[PDB]
């Protein structure tokens, strides 16, 4: 695998370059059906870009197609969510689902059970901002999620790749002037937030399952197949 031969800098550049674009919602300036409609439409279009982002994550192509499918099926909502909280950082108290779709917790009440998930998302974004999370760190965290979340539901290659990403995270912190104690302390803090992201994803899945059962909004066959993967 060529991923293991990459230096730290080469690792960072590859991840930064693989970053998907920031998509827009639909242009018209909120009920449950309308809000969930926009979010679902948005998630569906982002899934297409995520899949191509994933193929560009070092080590991911070296996996079998079946393993690629499993990792994405397990992690897709986590990856959308960490993307959401990342671009919501500079907007304290709000969720920037899209540049033209910036929501607050009052909007979360339009749908039911959404408010809880909104507050968690907002908390996580706040945690990122107060940690001064950098874009280099973010892309590392997002790739860790992709390779780790489904890894125990199958492995050695993935763990080698995961190790290489750890080395890259440390490499960035040592470059930012952090001392040895600061380096591993920050590494722990970052990785522990991944546990919360997992929690948010699981609560999110159930809500999307409730939506599919309500028949409320239409969801794409792709989004449905990703959802069924957790059933």
């Amino acid at each position: 695998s060529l991923a293991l031969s990459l230096t730290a800098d080469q690792m960072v550049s590859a991840l930064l370059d693989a970053e998907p674009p920031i998509l827009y919602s639909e242009y018209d300036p909120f009920s449950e059906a309308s809000m969930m409609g926009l979010l679902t439409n948005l998630a569906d279009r982002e899934l297409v870009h995520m899949i191509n982002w994933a193929k560009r994550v070092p080590g991911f192509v070296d996996l079998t197609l079946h393993d690629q499918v499993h990792l994405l099926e397990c992690a897709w909502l986590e990856i959308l969510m960490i993307g959401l909280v990342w671009r919501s950082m500079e907007h304290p108290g709000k969720l920037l689902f899209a540049p033209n779709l910036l929501l607050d917790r009052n909007q979360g009440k339009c749908v039911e059970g959404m408010v809880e998930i909104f507050d968690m998302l907002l908390a996580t974004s706040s945690r990122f901002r107060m940690m001064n999370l950098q874009g280099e760190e973010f892309v590392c965290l997002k790739s860790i999620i992709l390779l780790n979340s489904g890894v125990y539901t199958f492995k050695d290659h993935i763990h080698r790749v995961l190790d290489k990403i750890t080395d890259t995270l440390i490499h960035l912190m040592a470059k930012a002037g952090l001392t040895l104690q600061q380096q591993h302390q920050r590494l722990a803090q970052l990785l522990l937030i991944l546990s919360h992201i997992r929690h948010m994803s699981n609560k999110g899945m159930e809500h999307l399952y409730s939506m599919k059962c309500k028949n409320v909004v239409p969801l794409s066959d792709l989004l449905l197949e990703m959802l069924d993967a957790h059933r």
């Binding site: 899949i51 197609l65 499918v69 994405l72 066959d221 197949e225």
Partner: peptide
């Protein structure tokens, strides 16, 4: 099968 299969291949 899965739409995801197709998307990953191309």
């Amino acid at each position: 099968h899965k739409i995801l299969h197709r998307l990953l291949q191309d």
